[PDB]
Amino acid sequence: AKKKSKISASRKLQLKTLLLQIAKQELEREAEERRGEKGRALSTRAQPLELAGLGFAELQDLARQLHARVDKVDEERYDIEAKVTKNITEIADLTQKIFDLRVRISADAMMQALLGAR
Amino acid sequence: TEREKKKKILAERRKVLAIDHLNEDQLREKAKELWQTIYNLEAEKFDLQEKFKQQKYEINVLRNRINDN
Amino acid sequence: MDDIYKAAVEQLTEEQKNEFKAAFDIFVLGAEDGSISTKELGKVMRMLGQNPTPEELQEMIDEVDEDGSGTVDFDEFLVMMVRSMKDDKSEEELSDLFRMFDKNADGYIDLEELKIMLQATGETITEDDIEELMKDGDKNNDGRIDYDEFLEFMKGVE
Ligand SMILES: [Ca+2]
Ligand SMILES: [Ca+2]
Ligand SMILES: [Ca+2]
């Protein structure tokens, strides 16, 4: 045997339907906020290149500088990628442990059955 | 040691082999290219850097959930 | 607690509530107390090609039984039809919104965060609104809505 509730159940839905509407929306903002942190952060590491003024020994030594960096960075990127990978495992691993701890009827078919032709 | 000379030399070689024949105008062309790829990478890193962060968080809420059940 | 169906029930037209009455007043013929016990749900299932065991049946009922009667009354039957109404958030998605609530990244949505979030919406959040949601959410009552509760809590929410 059990009892009744405090506020209109239809309302509770509308808030729930709204807490999400916002969060979903507040996510889009955290997202548009990232795309912006990407540009500004790339403008710091990946400074813009102004060749217009460089000479030959200037242009070459830089081409050498760059060629040299490409490898250093592709490695940094591997290490993180490395870890983000270990995590997919990790996350999918714990996701498993939790998982381990944790007929058919339509409405109209029934109504059809009870009332007849309605 | 000797094995270490090779890495140093063959490293320099790679630089020579790609840039040395390039001309004033072809370098600008190369520097652009090279920079462009350096950037592309630094960006691939970012999204990952971000990925890794949300991951720190995804996991944590997992350890939370677990201890609780 | 609460539900996406309960609201659906309050949502049925006065014309709707009626046909279910009929459907219900028939579904009960030959029933002593005037409620749907297995013997009755059995009768109809059988018209639908099914023939569940008492157990499979009693279980079909407990999912709707709210007064431990062990049988389905109109209101309950009322809910039962809403449930069986029709089918139309993914875990992955909610996992992301829950994150948007948890502002202190402790992996738990607490009163403060709930309220903060609760205020984000245009609607005039009353003192009752708050106490109630936090009430359906915290099915364990530990002060904070945990990921799993946040799941069952937002369950079905369009
Ligand atoms: Ca009952
Ligand atoms: Ca929190
Ligand atoms: Ca809780």
Curated annotation (Swiss-Prot), chain A:
The keyword Phosphoprotein applies. One of its GO terms (biological process) is heart contraction. The record marks 46, 63 as: Involved in TNI-TNT interactions. Residues 1-45 are annotated as: Involved in binding TNC. The modification Phosphoserine is found at residues 8, 10, 43, 106. Phosphorylated at Ser-8 and Ser-10 by PRKCE; phosphorylation increases myocardium contractile dysfunction. Phosphorylation by STK4/MST1 alters its binding affinity to TNNC1 (cardiac Tn-C) and TNNT2 (cardiac Tn-T). The modification Phosphothreonine is found at residues 17, 44, 95. It comes from the Eukaryota. GO terms for molecular function: actin binding; actin filament binding; calcium channel inhibitor activity; calcium-dependent protein binding; protein domain specific binding; protein kinase binding; troponin C binding; troponin T binding. Keywords: Acetylation, Actin-binding, Cardiomyopathy, Disease variant, Muscle protein, Phosphoprotein. One of its GO terms (cellular component) is sarcomere. Troponin I is the inhibitory subunit of troponin, the thin filament regulatory complex which confers calcium-sensitivity to striated muscle actomyosin ATPase activity. It is linked to Cardiomyopathy, familial hypertrophic, 7: A hereditary heart disorder characterized by ventricular hypertrophy, which is usually asymmetric and often involves the interventricular septum. The symptoms include dyspnea, syncope, collapse, palpitations, and chest pain. They can be readily provoked by exercise. The disorder has inter- and intrafamilial variability ranging from benign to malignant forms with high risk of cardiac failure and sudden cardiac death. Cardiomyopathy, familial restrictive 1: A heart disorder characterized by impaired filling of the ventricles with reduced diastolic volume, in the presence of normal or near normal wall thickness and systolic function. Belongs to the troponin I family. Binds to actin and tropomyosin. Interacts with TRIM63. Interacts with STK4/MST1. This is Troponin I, cardiac muscle. The gene is TNNI3. The chain holds residues 35 to 162 of 210 of the full protein.
Swiss-Prot record, chain B:
Heart. The fetal heart shows a greater expression in the atrium than in the ventricle, while the adult heart shows a greater expression in the ventricle than in the atrium. Isoform 6 predominates in normal adult heart. Isoforms 1, 7 and 8 are expressed in fetal heart. Isoform 7 is also expressed in failing adult heart. The modification Phosphothreonine is found at residue 1. Phosphorylation at Thr-1 by PRKCA induces significant reduction in myofilament calcium sensitivity and actomyosin ATPase activity. Coiled coil: none annotated. It comes from the Eukaryota. It is linked to Cardiomyopathy, familial hypertrophic, 2: A hereditary heart disorder characterized by ventricular hypertrophy, which is usually asymmetric and often involves the interventricular septum. The symptoms include dyspnea, syncope, collapse, palpitations, and chest pain. They can be readily provoked by exercise. The disorder has inter- and intrafamilial variability ranging from benign to malignant forms with high risk of cardiac failure and sudden cardiac death. Troponin T is the tropomyosin-binding subunit of troponin, the thin filament regulatory complex which confers calcium-sensitivity to striated muscle actomyosin ATPase activity. Belongs to the troponin T family. This is Troponin T, cardiac muscle. The lineage of its organism: Eukaryota, Metazoa, Chordata, Craniata, Vertebrata. The gene is TNNT2.
Curated annotation (Swiss-Prot), chain C:
SUPFAM superfamilies: EF-hand. GO terms for cellular component: cardiac Troponin complex; cytosol; sarcomere; troponin complex. InterPro entries: CALM/Myosin/TropC-like, EF-hand-dom_pair, EF_Hand_1_Ca_BS, EF_hand_dom. GO terms for molecular function: actin filament binding; calcium ion binding; calcium-dependent protein binding; protein homodimerization activity; troponin I binding; troponin T binding. One of its GO terms (biological process) is regulation of muscle filament sliding speed. Ca(2+) 2 binds at residues 102, 104, 106, 108, 113. Ca(2+) 1 binds at residues 65, 67, 69, 71, 76. Keywords: Acetylation, Calcium, Cardiomyopathy, Disease variant, Metal-binding, Muscle protein, Phosphoprotein, Repeat. The modification N-acetylmethionine is found at residue 1. The modification Phosphoserine is found at residue 95. This is Troponin C, slow skeletal and cardiac muscles. It comes from Homo sapiens.
